[PDB]
């Protein structure tokens, strides 16, 4: 049947339909801070989101996506471990049913309440579809979310969730500025990996920010009211839509800081 996060179609079953689930550069991974290699040659990250143009927000039955107009260099990522310019196409979240779980990557085994993924594709390849055929086709910016004070720049997303409660629904979502989701510091860890949901393609250069952002309990609660199911089907709350840590194998995690 279709993949998901339930006992019968969850992460442990994915390999039957996507053999790459057992590949050599799968994500997410646990970030062991004492084994990460400080690399002084790593350049600072360059996030240029001033001309970003959001279009829609959609519930796809797994998570919700905020999609951006990527027809021009409006919101791009460059610098850091990257060569070339990467265009923002969408961002989504992974969260848990409880505050002690929800993130995909863990730091020294610690799980955060959620994890934000800002997906970008290498412009050298023309479109997203071509990008996913290359080892360096994608760049994902990962931001941990912890429960504390409210993130003002997240409320606009929180407010629209009502209208896209079920699988397949979408709503126009223009003029959203993704800079309001960024932490103060841009220090990060980086390693080569993959998408964390099928097709689990190994085309991603992961950039995980060290500093997490805080969101209120009320903000995260609203994410948990979403539905995995389509309307007219038995209610199945969209929670725990995260994949467990995968073996690091022959990879090294590099830190941009000491
Ligand atoms: Hg690839
Ligand atoms: Zn993700």
Curated annotation (Swiss-Prot):
Effect noted on mutating residue 92 to Y: In OPTB3; partial loss of activity
Effect of residue 195 to A: Reduced CO(2) hydrase activity
Effect caused by changing residue 65 to Q: 2-fold decrease in enzyme efficiency, as determined by kcat/KM ratio, and efficiently inhibited by chlorzolamide
pH profile of the protein: Optimum pH is 6-8.
Pfam families found in the cross-reference section: Carb_anhydrase
Molecular-function annotations in GO: arylesterase activity; carbonate dehydratase activity; cyanamide hydratase activity; zinc ion binding
Protein name (database record): Carbonic anhydrase 2
Gene: CA2
């Amino acid at each position: 049947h279709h993949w998901g996060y339930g006992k019968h179609n969850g992460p442990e079953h994915w390999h039957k339909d996507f053999p790459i689930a057992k590949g050599e550069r799968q994500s997410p991974v646990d970030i062991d801070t004492h084994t990460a290699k400080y690399d002084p040659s790593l350049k600072p990250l360059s996030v240029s989101y001033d001309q970003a143009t959001s279009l829609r927000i959609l519930n796809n039955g797994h998570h919700f996506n905020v999609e951006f107009d990527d027809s021009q260099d409006k919101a791009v990522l460059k610098g850091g471990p990257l060569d070339g310019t990467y265009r923002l196409i969408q961002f989504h979240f992974h969260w848990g049913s409880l505050d002690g779980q929800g993130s995909e990557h863990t730091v020294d085994k610690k799980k955060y309440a959620a994890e934000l993924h800002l997906v970008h594709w290498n412009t050298k390849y023309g479109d997203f579809g071509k990008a996913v055929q290359q080892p360096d086709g994608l760049a994902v910016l990962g931001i941990f979310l912890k429960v504390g004070s409210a993130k003002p720049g997240l409320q606009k997303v929180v407010d629209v969730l009502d209208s896209i409660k079920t699988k397949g629904k979408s709503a126009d979502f223009t003029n959203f500025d993704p800079r309001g989701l960024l932490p103060e510091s841009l220090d990060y860890w980086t390693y080569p990996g993959s998408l964390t949901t099928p097709p689990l393609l190994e085309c991603v250069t992961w950039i995980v920010l060290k500093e997490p952002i805080s969101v209120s309990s009320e903000q995260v609660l609203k994410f948990r009211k979403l539905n995995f199911n389509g309307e007219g089907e038995p209610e199945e709350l969209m929670v725990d839509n995260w994949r467990p840590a995968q073996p690091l194998k022959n990879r090294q995690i590099k830190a941009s800081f000491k």
